[PDB]
Amino acid sequence: HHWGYGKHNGPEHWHKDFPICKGERQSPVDIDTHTAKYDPSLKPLSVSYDQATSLRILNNGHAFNVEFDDSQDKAVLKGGPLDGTYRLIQFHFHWGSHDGQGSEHTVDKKKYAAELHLVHWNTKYGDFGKAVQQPDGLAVLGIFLKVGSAKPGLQKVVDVLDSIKTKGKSADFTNFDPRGLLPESLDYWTYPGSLTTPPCLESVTWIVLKEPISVSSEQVSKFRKLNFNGEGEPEEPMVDNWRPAQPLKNRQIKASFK
Numbered sequence: 001h002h003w004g005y006g007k008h009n010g011p012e013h014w015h016k017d018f019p020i021c022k023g024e025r026q027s028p029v030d031i032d033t034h035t036a037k038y039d040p041s042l043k044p045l046s047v048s049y050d051q052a053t054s055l056r057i058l059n060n061g062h063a064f065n066v067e068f069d070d071s072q073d074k075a076v077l078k079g080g081p082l083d084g085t086y087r088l089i090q091f092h093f094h095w096g097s098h099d100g101q102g103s104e105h106t107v108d109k110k111k112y113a114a115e116l117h118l119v120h121w122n123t124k125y126g127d128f129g130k131a132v133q134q135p136d137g138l139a140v141l142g143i144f145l146k147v148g149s150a151k152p153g154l155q156k157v158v159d160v161l162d163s164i165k166t167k168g169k170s171a172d173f174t175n176f177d178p179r180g181l182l183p184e185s186l187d188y189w190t191y192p193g194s195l196t197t198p199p200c201l202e203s204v205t206w207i208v209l210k211e212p213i214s215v216s217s218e219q220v221s222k223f224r225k226l227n228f229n230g231e232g233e234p235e236e237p238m239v240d241n242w243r244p245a246q247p248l249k250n251r252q253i254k255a256s257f258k
C-alpha cells in the first residue's frame with residue numbers, strides 16, 4: 001500500500017499511482033453559486049432508509065466506515081438526477097485538524113468542519129465491484145457538518161469511536177438509523193464526478209445537500225481522537241483526511257432549487 005493524506009503520500013501524489021486522479025471529472029469541487037444553475041428537469045430526491053441495515057463500523061486507516069447490508073432492496077436512493085435505483089453500501093466522513101476545515105466540497109470557497117458521504121451503487125450493475133467501474137455506477141450523497149448544536153442521531157457513531165481507535169479495529173454496529181444524519185431540506189447541487197480517494201474512479205453522480213447538519217464541537221472533537229496508524233505503531237492522529245477542490249473542467253453544476 002502507500003497513499004494517504006501526508007505530505008509525501010497525500011493528494012498531490014496520488015496521480016502517480018492512479019493517473020485518473022488528474023482526470024476530467026474529478027471530485028470534490030468548489031460549488032460556485034454564481035455558476036451553478038437551477039434545472040427544473042431535476043426531481044425530488046427520494047431517500048428511503050427505513051429498512052437500512054447497518055452491520056459494523058471499521059477504522060480502515062483513512063476514515064471510519066459504517067457498513068450496511070446491501071443484499072436486499074433495503075436502503076435506496078432514487079430520483080433527483082438519478083435513473084433507477086441505488087443501494088446504500090456504506091457511509092464515512094472527512095474532517096479537519098480544527099473546525100475551520102475538513103469538508104471536501106466547498107461552497108463559494110467556504111470549508112465546513114466535516115463532510116459525510118453516503119455511498120450507493122446502481123443496482124443495474126448487480127454489485128458494487130461492477131458498479132464502481134461505470135460512469136453512472138455510484139451515487140454519493142454528501143452532507144456538510146457545521147459546528148453548533150449537537151446532532152442526536154450522530155451520538156451512537158461518536159461514542160463507538162473509542163473502541164476502533166487504530167487502523168484495522170472494528171465494532172458491531174447494528175440498528176443504526178442513518179435518517180438521523182439528514183438535515184431538514186433535501187435541496188441539492190449535482191454534478192458528475194469521482195471517488196475522492198484513490199482509485200479516483202470517475203463513476204459518481206454527486207448529490208451535495210445545500211443544508212448542513214449541525215453537530216457539536218464535542219462530537220467532532222471525537223473524530224480527531226482516531227488514529228491513522230495501527231495498534232503498537234507510533235501515534236498519528238486521524239485529521240485532515242480530506243481531498244481539496246479539483247478543477248471543474250467542462251462540467252456544469254446544477255441546482256435543484258431556485
Ligand SMILES: C[C@H](CCC(=O)O)[C@H]1CC[C@H]2[C@@H]3[C@H](O)C[C@@H]4C[C@H](O)CC[C@]4(C)[C@H]3C[C@H](O)[C@]12C
Nearest residue numbers: 065067089090092117119128195196197198199
Ligand atoms: C474509497 C471509497 C470512498 C471514497 C471517499 O472517501 O469518498 C469507498 C466507498 C465504498 C468503499 C467499498 C465498499 O465499502 C465495499 C467494499 C468493502 C470492503 O471492506 C473493502 C472494499 C470495498 C470495495 C470498499 C472499497 C472502498 O473503501 C470504497 C470504494
Ligand SMILES: [Mg+2]
Nearest residue numbers: 001002003062
Ligand atoms: Mg488504502
Ligand SMILES: [Zn+2]
Nearest residue numbers: 092094117196
Ligand atoms: Zn468520502
